[PDB]
A paper describes a structure:
The Mps1 and Aurora B kinases regulate and monitor kinetochore attachment to spindle microtubules during cell division, ultimately ensuring accurate chromosome segregation. The Ndc80c head is thus a communication hub for ensuring a robust linkage between centromere and spindle and for integrating the SAC with tension sensing and error correction.
We generated a chimeric construct that fused to the N-terminus of Ndc80cdwarf Nuf2 a peptide containing Ipl1 residues 26–59, with 40–44 (a disordered loop in the AF2 prediction) deleted. When phased only on the molecular-replacement model, a difference map showed strong density for ordered parts of the Ipl1 segment and a structure overall that was consistent with the AF2 prediction between Ipl1 residues 48 and 56. The density for this segment was continuous with that for the Nuf2 subunit of the non-crystallographic-symmetry related complex. Thus, the asymmetric unit is a “domain-swapped” dimer, and the interactions may have been essential for the crystals to form, suggesting that the interaction might occur in solution. Although both sequence alignment and AF2 prediction suggest a potential first part of a bipartite motif, the density map was not continuous enough in the predicted region to build any structure with confidence. The Ipl1 peptide bound more weakly than those from Dam1 and Mps1, but avidity contributed by the two copies of the conserved motif might enhance binding of the intact protein.
Author numbering:
A (entry chain C): 6 to 48, 162 to 212
B (entry chain A): 113 to 318, 621 to 684
C (entry chain D): 2 to 31, 138 to 220
D (entry chain B): 48 to 64, 1007 to 1153, 1407 to 1451
Write the structure that this text describes.
Amino acid sequence: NLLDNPVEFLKEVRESFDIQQDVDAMKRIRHDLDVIKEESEARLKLYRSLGVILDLENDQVLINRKNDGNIDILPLDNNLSDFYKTKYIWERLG
Amino acid sequence: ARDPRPLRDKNFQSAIQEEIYDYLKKNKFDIETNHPISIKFLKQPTQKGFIIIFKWLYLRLDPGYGFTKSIENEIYQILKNLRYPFLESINKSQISAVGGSNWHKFLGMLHWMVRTNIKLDMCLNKVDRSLINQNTQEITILSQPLKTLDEQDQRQERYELMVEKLLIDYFTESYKSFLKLEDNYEPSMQELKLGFEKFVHIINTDVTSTELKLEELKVDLNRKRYKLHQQVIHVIDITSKFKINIQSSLENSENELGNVIEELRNLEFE
Amino acid sequence: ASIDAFSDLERRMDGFQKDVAQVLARQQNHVALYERLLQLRVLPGASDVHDVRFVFGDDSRCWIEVAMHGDHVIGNSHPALDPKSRATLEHVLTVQGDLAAFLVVARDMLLAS
Amino acid sequence: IPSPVREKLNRLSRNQDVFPILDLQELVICLQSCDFALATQENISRPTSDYMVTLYKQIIENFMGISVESLLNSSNQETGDGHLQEENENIYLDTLNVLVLNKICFKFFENIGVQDFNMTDLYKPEAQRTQRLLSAVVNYARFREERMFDCNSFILQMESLLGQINKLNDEIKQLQKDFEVEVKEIEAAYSLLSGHINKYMNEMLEYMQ
């Protein structure tokens, strides 16, 4: 009752893979990561030396500019960030 | 080419005479021919009584043979045609008077005939059993639940053999009546009609058997094909989802990184 | 003639699809992001003797350029500031030697002016 | 006062001879046309042994539809006789076979009006006896050929019934052959693709480690 023509069906699957498109894609993806990495490096060390450390493992941001780990965190979820995150990330600094 | 049996040994002659006499009395020699049999007679015989014994034995080997008026002149030729393995060991001179000193050579020839007769019955049983075997051809292939042989048509050639065996019987009997100036073969024809109905009933078993087997291969292949097709569906169903998701991933990655690099190098005020 | 061993390839599909996810986990810009949150960008200076230029705000309202080669105390500001505001900033980079302290104070002077 | 005699117990001998004696050329033409190619006027006029033995075997296998080899086979029972003790000898062999061949002809000829077949006819054949025996055979063959149309209805019924077996058996082997071919050719389209998929992932791994 099924598979009117299973032979053509299988052929389409081989023809839907395309190795070169993805191989070419792989060259471009590896290149783009290097461009972001290399052109962010000098700046990224500057932002790291600021003391502003970032946790993306657990959806919060830590502040460590009071010689203690008791500085209040800011979540990354359910938030405006429209002059919202910026106020908190300027009042927690000193 | 000489006979290895010790025909000259006198002890052997005494032993087999008793054993021979018992066998001779049992098979009605002294009744079928008026000539009596005795251990004394088997000790040293007369020529007349020997020819009676030889003829009686040979007719059991070759019933259609027509003996000449003086059997002594064809005994050698008879053994030659028979391919008697011990012909050279028997000299033509002693056939004239077998009752003399050389009676032992002729007792052993007669004794060998008895052993051949004994062995012939076993042969005829095997031929008979072969007839039984041919009786198997008729019934042995058909009683296989299913047969194993390289040609389903060989069973058929056996079937044809089963059928042909009927016509040889039919035409053999009809010919007997024809030679008796008779022309009515209806007895033979009615027997053939009845036997052929058995065939029709039995070959009908193959038709019915084959039809049912055929309908089961049809059902089984359709279901197996459906099961196999389901295997193909599963492979195709999840393979396409795999590729499209990665195509999305590849597409998403490329748009992601293209926009980042533009922003990273856009140092204008905008 | 391949069949029934699809579970082997199925493992390969599930494994490779998620090895892809691990390697391609979306690296954040960390610089487009930092500039978006703070309205603060780090760009090369127009006068490349003074290397690093800092831009504040969504538009070109406030900016200043600094050497950052060594003891970097270069005066430069789009909203001009008095010497007293300029002397306090020059001491934080000289008598305090704290970049982080110098950066928060400088933007407050510029945005208010 | 003498009494008459019924000589024609020899009419019964003539009655035993009711089948016709065929002229040499006609007897051979008919015998050859029965597909006994070995039969010739020259050999049959001077019969030799080992020729008659071969020629007789061909005749029996046609009219009886049997294998002489199978006949030699059935003479030698496989198991059940004398196995424990050999008695040290291959003797009796062929001698028994020679008398069995004699019996086969004897029984057959009894059926077609010959009551006195014997070893001379096999192993020192003579011309008049040889043509007499073969003429009875031919007359029997002609009777069978002539009367073969009595059984054509049976043959036609048999051929119909045999046709149904063969047609059904042809369908079975066709169906079972076609499905195995269909299965593999689809699997080849998949087997090519399965190797392709392992190849694709392996190349992509080169740029992920």
